[PDB]
Amino acid sequence: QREYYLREQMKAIQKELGGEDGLSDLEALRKKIEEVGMPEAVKTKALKELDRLERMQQGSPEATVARTYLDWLTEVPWSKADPEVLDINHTRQVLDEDHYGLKDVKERILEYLAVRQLTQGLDVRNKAPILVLVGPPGVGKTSLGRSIARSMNRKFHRISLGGVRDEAEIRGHRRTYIGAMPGKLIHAMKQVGVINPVILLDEIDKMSSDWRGDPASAMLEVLDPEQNNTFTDHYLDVPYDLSKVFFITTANTLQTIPRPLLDRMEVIEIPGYTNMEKQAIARQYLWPKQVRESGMEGRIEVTDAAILRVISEYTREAGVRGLERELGKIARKGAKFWLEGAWEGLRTIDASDIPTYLGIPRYRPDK
């Protein structure tokens, strides 16, 4: 009765002090606290904190730090996941809808997805592969992340490490500063609603160092499967649990990745396509896209011999960006010729009609 009557007096004085807020402030933040999570030390630290913002209303810069720290602390997911997959026959069907070929990456995903069923007595969910995909520029390394996320029914988020020179892009700044915010990883874990997404780190061989810091030293702490159980940035004081996260990183060469990161990654090399692989990719992915995006759908059509003519005589490369630029050129000039004088039915571009659209061939074929 004594603690309750004193808390009644607190409620009364705050009632004349509050204006529906200062009053509905906690039932905001404690439905936020008691609904999600949480680990016990983090909850006790947050509750030994939450009392101590009796400081606004003639103030404060003290309350606008603490309440936003509690806002960041109650919207990052604590132990809330998505259901695991039950067919490895459905994952294969979804992976074959988006890309042609690429048997090594697809089989490696199916292997590490079939290991995760058979293990009860758990050593495996602590170790998802830190996977790195290495290859020449036109091959589908970046567009393969979203398909892997869709086939396992998991959430996706891409982080681009292109020219990052700054620590506190990985970690944060401590909340004693003015505009302190957490890093990219806590922000990505907030955007994704769950604790087990797929995260793509786009060019990891391209990070820059600096005199003040080096983000590779911070990226070691994230991709280490002995430290990311207790990952801690500078904004959130509490340790945070990664390693439910499935990381995929992509790269052009291995020679400029730092040495403490190469030894903790499994490397899959992607070599570049042959001409039959490029002809299949062209026919069932690249030509319908370029026909749709130019308006000429149902009015023009290319044959297989013409696709071989384009591949052999107008491009040489490992990937497929130049091939889709040539096919888009055929679509643009088809639109131009239609808009001059229309025809009916569909015009069929045969292999002796390619220099009408593309010009003089660039490479002479071997014979």
Q: Which residues are annotated as a binding site for ADP?
A: 99-101, 138-143, 146, 158, 259, 273, 289, 321, 324
Q: Are 157 and 191 in contact (CB under 8 A)?
A: yes
Rule CB under 8 A: is residue 124 a binding residue for a copy of itself?
A: yes
Q: Which of residues 194-213 bind a copy of itself (CB under 8 A)?
A: 202-203, 206, 208-213
Task: Using the minimum distance from each CB to a copy of itself, give the nearer residue, 57 or 93.
Answer: 57
Q: Rounded to an integer, what distance in angstroms lies between the CA atom of residue 170 and that of residue 255? A: 23
State in angstroms the smallest separation of the CB of 182 from ligand AGS: 24
Rule CB under 6 A: is residue 139 a binding residue for ligand AGS?
A: yes
Q: Which of 222, 196, 224 is nearest to 116 (CA)?
A: 196
* Binding residues with ligand AGS: total (CB under 6 A): 19
Rule CB under 8 A: is residue 307 a binding residue for a copy of itself?
A: no
Interface residue with a copy of itself, options 34, 47, 93, 163 (CB under 8 A): 163
State in angstroms the smallest separation of the CB of 367 from a copy of itself: 27
Rule CB under 6 A: is residue 126 a binding residue for ligand AGS?
A: no
**Distance from chain centroid for Cα 57:** 42
Locate 235 and state its tokens. Answer: 């904004």
User: What strands, in cross-sheet order, belong to the sheet with 266-269?
Assistant: 156-159, 198-201, 246-251, 131-134, 266-269
Rule CB under 6 A: is residue 156 a binding residue for ligand AGS?
A: no
Q: Tell me how crowded residue 41 is: count the other CB atoms within 10 A of its CB.
A: 10
For 294, residues 6+ apart whose C-beta sits below 8 A from its C-beta are 328, 331, 332, 334, 335
Q: Rounded to an integer, what distance in angstroms lies between the CA atom of residue 367 and that of residue 364? A: 9
Stretch that binds ligand AGS, among 14-22, 137-145, 150-158, 331-339 (CB under 6 A): 137-145
Interface residue with ligand AGS, options 66, 70, 199, 320 (CB under 6 A): 320
Q: Which of residues 339-358 bind a copy of itself (CB under 8 A)?
A: 339
Interface residue with ligand AGS, options 14, 26, 92, 100 (CB under 6 A): 100
Q: Which residue has the tokens 């069929």?
A: 348
Interface residue with a copy of itself, options 8, 84, 269, 293 (CB under 8 A): 293
62, amino acid identity = E
State in angstroms the smallest separation of the CB of 283 from a copy of itself: 20
Rule CB under 8 A: is residue 44 a binding residue for a copy of itself?
A: no
Locate 200 and state its tokens. Answer: 């793509």
Burial class (CB in 10 A: 0-12, 13-18, 19+), 124: middle
Annotated binding-site positions for ATP: 135-142
Interface residue with ligand AGS, options 141, 154, 171, 278 (CB under 6 A): 141
For 99, residues 6+ apart whose C-beta sits below 8 A from its C-beta are 140, 143, 144, 147
Rule CB under 8 A: is residue 89 a binding residue for a copy of itself?
A: no
State in angstroms the smallest separation of the CB of 37 from ligand AGS: 27
State in angstroms the smallest separation of the CB of 66 from a copy of itself: 8
Q: Are 25 and 15 in contact (CB under 8 A)?
A: no
Q: Which of 38, 35, 49 is nearest to 240 (CA)?
A: 38
Q: Are 47 and 70 in contact (CB under 8 A)?
A: no
Interaction partner, residue 294 (ligand AGS, a copy of itself, none; CB < 5-8 Å by kind):
a copy of itself
| Binding-site ranges for ligand AGS (CB under 6 A) | 99-102, 137-143, 226, 252, 260, 263, 281, 285, 320-321
